[PDB]
From a paper:
In bacteria, the highly conserved RsmA/CsrA family of RNA-binding proteins functions as global posttranscriptional regulators acting on mRNA translation and stability. Through phenotypic complementation of an rsmA mutant in Pseudomonas aeruginosa, we discovered a family member, termed RsmN. Elucidation of the RsmN crystal structure and that of the complex with a hairpin from the sRNA, RsmZ, reveals a uniquely inserted α helix, which redirects the polypeptide chain to form a distinctly different protein fold to the domain-swapped dimeric structure of RsmA homologs. The overall β sheet structure required for RNA recognition is, however, preserved with compensatory sequence and structure differences, allowing the RsmN dimer to target binding motifs in both structured hairpin loops and flexible disordered RNAs.
To elucidate the molecular details of the interaction, we solved the structure at 3.2 Å resolution of the RsmN dimer complex with two 16-mer RsmZ regulatory sRNA hairpins. The asymmetric unit contains an RsmN dimer with residues 3-66 of the 71 residue construct observed in the electron density. RsmN does not have the domain-swapped dimer structure evident for the RsmA orthologs; and as a result, each RsmN monomer contacts just one of the bound RNA hairpin motifs through a highly basic surface comprising Arg9, Arg49, Arg56, and Arg62. The two α helices of the RsmN dimer do not contact the RNA but lie side by side to generate a unique distal polar surface involving charged residues Glu25, Glu26, Arg29, Arg32, and Glu33 orthogonal to the RNA binding surfaces. Hydrogen bonding between the bases of G8 (N2) and G9 (O6 and N7) positions the “GG” motif in an orientation that presents the Watson-Crick edges of the two purines for a set of base-specific intermolecular hydrogen bonds through residues in strand β5 and the adjacent loop primarily through the amide groups in the polypeptide backbone. Ile60 forms multidentate contacts with both G8 and G9, supported by other specific CO or NH interactions from Ala54, Val58, and Arg62. In particular, Arg62 in RsmN is a residue that is highly conserved across the family of RsmA orthologs and is shown to form multidentate stabilizing contacts in the RNA complex, including a face-to-face π-stacking interaction of the guanidinium group with A6. At the C terminus, where the RsmA orthologs have a short α helix, RsmN has a shallow hydrophobic patch involving Leu59, Val61, and Leu65, which binds A7 nonspecifically in an analogous fashion to the corresponding C9 of hcnA (Schubert et al., 2007).
Author numbering:
A (entry chain A): 3 to 66
B (entry chain B): 2 to 66
Write the structure that this text describes.
Amino acid sequence: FLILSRREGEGITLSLKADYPAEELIRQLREGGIRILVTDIIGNQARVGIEAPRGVLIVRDELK
Amino acid sequence: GFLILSRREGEGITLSLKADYPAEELIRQLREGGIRILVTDIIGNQARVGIEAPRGVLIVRDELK
RNA sequence: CCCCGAAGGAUCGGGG
RNA sequence: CCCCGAAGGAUCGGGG
């Protein structure tokens, strides 16, 4: 699980790591799947959790 | 053009890839689009969440099985 | 409730 | 600010 705070209007982008083997990934999902939990909301700040095979990159949008 | 659904503290979303979509085809769609996650709005107890993703992926609120 | 941070895979960290 | 919906790909619909 990875945890980041977003406000209204802020996003999160899920590329997939360039290196990892193509087929490799696909099974982990057909089995695993990606999990998006909204672990706690407070005032203006949503606090999200993301759980994803290690071949997916997760970046807050403001990281280019 | 993405998918909108409200969640509360502790509520989730699970992203499946449709069982019929080809293995090799999906990859193409992420390689060129990624999957995006906007928090469109926050109001009180409920978070409003936008998710943009290739028809290859099934977006379901965690409480539908 | 604010504020600030977070290249972080952790249900993140720090301040009023 | 609440309520309740939402198998829905649409920055979702309904009531105070």
